[model samples]
Target: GEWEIIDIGPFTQNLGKFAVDEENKIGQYGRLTFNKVIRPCMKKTIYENEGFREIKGYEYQLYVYASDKLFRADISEDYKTRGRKLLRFNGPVPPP
Candidate 1:
């Protein structure tokens, strides 16, 4: 995949959840429900040393379809790939 940077925004914490359910009646589908949960943390942190704060690293985890769902994927039996590139940052922020 190829990606390009266009706009940069402030860093903030965010969390979300989603769920779906189905109900059955006498020989027919009764109702369907879709629920979404979200928790946002948009508090800004003050820095005493520098005028701007920089992002170091991030950590995250994902859980998909824990209930009665099956996951599948395809793997290559024999394949070869090679790639390399150099990234440089020349912005106003200082380098780490």
Candidate 2:
């Protein structure tokens, strides 16, 4: 819970669902909505490979490319709760 890498993206020219929203208004609720479900995220546009480098291993260390939502150094040391594996060339995220 101590992650903090910022500024490395303008991303997304491909791979779907860049942004979306549907909203209606009425406040003070537990879980109230007309259309609210957001998790389809991609497309910002900085283009091709981003920032951060302090390599050793995320332990199992692999990230070949979920293609890109591209993040690993939002600051440092969350490495999947330090069990490690953020190395990517694209693989294994095929398991959601």
Candidate 3:
């Protein structure tokens, strides 16, 4: 697929269950949910310390800190394919 960078940060925040359900009902596609997962964004980490400093090597690396419900649905293959490009963040996943 041609990486289109689907912006899903908002949907992830706004009633994610409804977001995914709505999309599923409408046949838009899946979503990316996780307890904790990190592959690689494949950029680089330089002197821009504060954010990239933690996870050195990959740039942003599409990091995520999901809830229990997220991990529950994460068992399905669709969880990954649906929101492939939904997560995009700099810095870190803060405590809530």
lDDT of 3 by residue, 1-96 (tens): 122222445533333343344434554334334344332212233232475443222112233344433221111112223323222232233433
**Candidate 1: worst-modelled 10 consecutive residues by lDDT:** 70-79
Q: lDDT for model 1, please.
A: 0.19
Model 2 spans with C-alpha error above 4 angstroms:
1-30, 34-40, 43-79, 82-96
> How does residue 27 of candidate 1 score in lDDT?
13
Give the lDDT of residue 71 in candidate 2: 19
The TM-score between candidate 2 and the true structure equals 0.14
TM-score of each candidate structure, all chains considered together: 0.15, 0.14, 0.20
Question: 1 or 3, which is superior by TM-score?
Answer: 3
The residue-level lDDT of candidate 2 at 21 comes to 10
How far out, in Å, is residue 24 in model 3? 0.3
Summarize candidate 2's per-residue lDDT along 1-96 as a digit string, tens digits: 122222222321111111111001221222122221112222121222337634432211111122243211111123335532112222113324
RMSD of each: 19.5, 16.2, 13.7
Query: Against the true structure, candidate 3 has what lDDT?
Result: 0.32
Compute the lDDT of residue 87 as modeled in candidate 1. Answer: 17
lDDT of 1 by residue, 1-96 (tens): 012211212211111111112111221223222122111111222223355764322221211121222111111111123211111111112212
